[PDB]
Amino acid sequence: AHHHHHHMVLNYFYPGTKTLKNKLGIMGYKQLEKRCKRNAKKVINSLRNEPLPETFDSSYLKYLHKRLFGSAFEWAGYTRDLSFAFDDGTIAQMSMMKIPGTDIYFAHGDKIQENLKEFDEILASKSNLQGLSREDFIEETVKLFSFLNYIHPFRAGNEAVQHIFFEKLAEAAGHKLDFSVVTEERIMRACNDAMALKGEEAHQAMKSLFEDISNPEEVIILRDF
């Protein structure tokens, strides 16, 4: 059955292309993508010698997105629920986003503000997951990470920002997460399963990922080295 996108949704791209409007004026999809990755890694590198924030919240998450993608996108740091005014005079919007190839949607734009508030309140009620065993830290991060993944509050760059956010959160809490330990395919399978499956099966998809990236080899005692 027929589908096409509203004009405000298409205003994220150059007319007649699938290339996101960008500050570099890069018209090629592949070339933009590669350059975004390069820019973002450079920034991830800087963040290693920057202080951790006092509060992990959506404000920090927006700050990080602006850092990661601000050289590329006018809208870096802005959440996709809001109408976005480009310098070119167009106004863009992305209320609905789904997992490509599915009918499985991320949060509707109408709920993003409320949902980010709820995210913020869970972290505040638990003091940024400080003072926890590795077991409780994994349980609570799995839930919070699935929730933020579902929200997908930016036009793009969601996964990259949520990874660094959670790596910084774990560092601050006295644990460690390192998403680079596993492949993209493994990460995206856990994320897609968290949204596609139900109940206990959905939680377990993401828990296996979290166990793998959180220094599980710490149980190996090598005192005699």
Numbering used by the authors: 1 to 225
How does the study describe this entry?
Proteins containing a FIC domain catalyze AMPylation and other post-translational modifications (PTMs). Among these, Bartonella effector proteins (Beps) comprise a particularly diverse ensemble of FIC domains that subvert various host cellular functions. The FIC fold comprises eight conserved α-helices and encompasses a characteristic active site loop between helices α4 and α5 that forms most of the catalytic center and the substrate binding pocket. Additionally, FIC domains generally contain a β-hairpin between helix α2 and helix α3 that is referred to as the “flap” and mediates docking of a target segment in extended conformation via β-strand augmentation.
